[model samples]
Target: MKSTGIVRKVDELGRVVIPIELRRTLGIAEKDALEIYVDDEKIILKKYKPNMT
Candidate 1:
């Protein structure tokens, strides 16, 4: 797995703030959709795309 050298913490409301640098590098803009994946104890997040189907 590739790391962004960034770390974030979940707030009480279970929210995390993605850094602007990472968002820009991933082409993730405001209101952009995201996908969450769970593998055992691991959590993954990715930019969502309708055309992925």
Candidate 2:
């Protein structure tokens, strides 16, 4: 996925609130998975999905 030039700061205890726009995109007709990957100096958020009915 690519950034939409949008950004958010982590919370006091280390938290980055996902943009509503991201929440809007993570789906294949229905909600699936979100990868909580953290790179040393970079945080990468990814969306992976599985078969669903």
Candidate 3:
């Protein structure tokens, strides 16, 4: 995941919202798959691409 240059607050249950602009730019619509990872002190979010071959 790249730096978004935007800061957001985590909700009561430790949830962060991804902005709409970024979602559209990345072509990720409703129900799109996401992968999360942790590296040291950083958290990573990745869009999952399905291989239909």
Candidate 4:
């Protein structure tokens, strides 16, 4: 996986916010759902949609 070199901290509620530019680049708009992933030693997220899911 590649890194964007961006950093974000978890809030007291354990929530992290995505950057506007990053979100826009991914075409993930407001309320867009995200898919969770857990690899050996990594955690990743993706838009929870597949033109057919």
Candidate 5:
């Protein structure tokens, strides 16, 4: 894992914006869905893909 050393403050609504560079590097785009998870005191975000259930 790598860190960009970037930090963002959460808003009153608990929103934290991801940096543009990171988004571009991760291929995340506007309106794209993301899945969030928590494991071992860490928060993880990944691109969302629909499950065929």
Candidate 6:
């Protein structure tokens, strides 16, 4: 995977907005669940699986 090196800011509520371009490139849709994590000094964001149960 290639890094876009896009930087973002966290709001007062600790929320970050993903850019529409990146979201579309990753096939991210509205209301989709995401998993957040801290890996060392890097923050990781991953797509969450949606079980059709």
TM-score of candidate 5 against the unseen true structure: 0.71
In the predicted model 4, the residue pairs found to clash are none
- Provide the TM-score for each candidate, comma-separated: 0.68, 0.50, 0.63, 0.71, 0.71, 0.72
Residues 1-53, candidate 4: write the lDDT tens digits: 23477987865687677776777777786688778798988777787785764
lDDT of 5 by residue, 1-53 (tens): 23587898775687678777776776777577678898989888787785559
lDDT of 3 by residue, 1-53 (tens): 34568877775697676766666667675577667788999887677676568
**Candidate 5 local accuracy as lDDT?**
0.73
Please tell me which model should have the higher TM-score, number 4 or number 5: 4
TM-score winner, 3 or 5: 5
* Best candidate, TM-score: 6
> Candidate 3 has what TM-score?
0.63
lDDT of 3: 0.70
Whose lDDT is greatest here? 1
The residue pairs that clash in candidate 3, if any, are none
**Model 4 poorest ten-residue lDDT run:** 1-10
Q: Give a tens-digit lDDT track for model 2, residues 1-53.
A: 53577878876787666677666766422245567578898767677645467
lDDT, model 2, position 37? 78
Clashes of 2: 0
Off-target runs (Cα >4 Å) in candidate 4 are: 1-3, 50-53
**Tens digit per residue, CA lDDT, model 1, 1-53:** 23587788775687778776787877776588778898999887788885854
RMSD (Å) per prediction: 3.3, 4.1, 3.0, 3.0, 3.1, 2.0
* lDDT agreement with native, every candidate: 0.76, 0.63, 0.70, 0.73, 0.73, 0.74
